Amino acid sequence: TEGRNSIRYSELSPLYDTTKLYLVDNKSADIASLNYQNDHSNFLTTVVQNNDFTPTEASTQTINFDERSRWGGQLKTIMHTNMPNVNEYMFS
Amino acid sequence: TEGRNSIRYSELSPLYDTTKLYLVDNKSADIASLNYQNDHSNFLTTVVQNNDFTPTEASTQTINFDERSRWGGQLKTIMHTNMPNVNEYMFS
Amino acid sequence: GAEQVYWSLPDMMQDPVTFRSTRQVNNYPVVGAELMPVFSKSFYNEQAVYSQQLRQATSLTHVFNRFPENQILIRPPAPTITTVSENVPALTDHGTLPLRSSIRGVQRVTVTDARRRTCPYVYKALGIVAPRVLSSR
């Protein structure tokens, strides 16, 4: 199991066999640059938390997990909605 | 020669068998913090160029070169002075 | 004042130790240091009083030396040695540093000040890199 479980970003230290990846939408940099036409159901967000890079030039780095191993990670979601009773979208 | 020639800072990537180390005195952080009583002939300066650390809390990290090898590096200096002909310091 | 100058080259050489890999303009990890090429030079006019007595007769009525009768407010005499700055070219050799594996076609260069700002008085800049082999892998 040792050896083949490193997680290299590009230039930081390599991790080993557990991280976390945050898919948030409340970053103040994505509001002005990437997401301009779309809303909270179809947005576009970044993973790197480095803040030496604007997200137009942060769309190039690759968080390459180690090969010669099959990876895979579980998913946890939190959603919150507010729809009325009678509305036009659901034919009511 | 391979293997035993890494240069680890503490958390960045390891280099290999050539760097440079700058002993400057014109940093704007050392003027307000470290050097307050002394002058250009007996000053006290930092080596880390990270600027996430004030130099009072940067006096803890160690740039440890790799063991099982004897190291050693050459020195180049640049000094510039202005003394008068007749003065009191040199009994003239 | 003799200030230092920093060369940066962030697409060919690797980063030196304790430097963060960034693409902001005013950080740009430094690859070598020098001195600003502005020297001094002495000339020894040796007269300095007759050459001041005669200079304000054919060139200067009373524009400088407005009060040519009061002893305290009189024009100061010129020294017997005079010093003027000058600009010379600088040829330097900075030693070896490790370079990257793949080199892109376009490259950046940057020449900064001690307070991380570009000096506008640079007229010519020129560099030559000659790769060699170091330890194996």
Q: Note the maximum CA span of chain B.
A: 59
Long-range contacts of the stretch A53-61 (C-beta < 8 A, 24+)? A53/C23, A54/A29, A55/A27, A55/A29, A55/A30, A57/C23, A61/A9, A61/A10
Closest chain C residue to B22, measured at CA: C33
Residues in chain A: 92
State the nearest Cα–Cα gap between B5 and chain C, in angstroms: 9
Contact partners, residue B67, CB within 8 Å, separation at least 6 = none
Long-range contacts of the stretch B68-76 (C-beta < 8 A, 24+)? B68/B4, B69/B4, B69/B5, B73/B21
Which of A12, A13, A51 would best serve as a mutation to test chain B binding (most B beta carbons within 10 A)? A13
Tokens encoding C7: 């060369």
B15 CB neighbour count, 10 Å cutoff? 19
State the nearest Cα–Cα gap between A3 and chain C, in angstroms: 17
CB contact under 8 A, A57 and C23: yes
Edge-first strand order for the sheet with C4-8 is C30-35, C4-8, C110-112
Residue C35 pairs in a beta bridge with C4
If contacts are CB pairs under 8 Å, which of residues 32-91 in chain B contact chain A? none
Instruction: Quote the CA–CA distance of C92 and C89 in Å, as a whole number.
Output: 10
Contact partners, residue C27, CB within 8 Å, separation at least 6 = B51, C20, C116
Give me the phi and psi of C32, to 5 degrees please: -175, 160
Per-residue 3-state assignment (H helix, E strand, C coil) for B69-88: CCCCCCCCCCCCCCCCCCCC
Instruction: Quote the CA–CA distance of A67 and A65 in Å, as a whole number.
Output: 7
Residues on chain C touching A57 (C-beta within 8 angstroms):
23
Resolution (angstroms) stands at: 3.5
CB contact under 8 A, B18 and C17: no
A37 to each of A42, A56, A82, B28, C44, how far by Cα in Å? 10, 16, 21, 44, 74
Contact call for residues A49 and A58 (beta carbons, < 8 A): no
Contact partners, residue C83, CB within 8 Å, separation at least 6 = C40, C41, C42, C43
Instruction: Quote the CA–CA distance of C121 and C36 in Å, as a whole number.
Output: 11
Instruction: Quote the CA–CA distance of B62 and B73 in Å, as a whole number.
Output: 17
Tokens encoding C31: 């690859």
Separation of first and last alpha carbons in chain B:
56
C131 to each of A38, C18, C28, C81, C135, how far by Cα in Å? 50, 24, 22, 49, 13
Contact partners, residue B41, CB within 8 Å, separation at least 6 = none
For chain B, list the contacting chains (3+ Cβ pairs, <8 Å): A, C
Contact call for residues C118 and C111 (beta carbons, < 8 A): yes
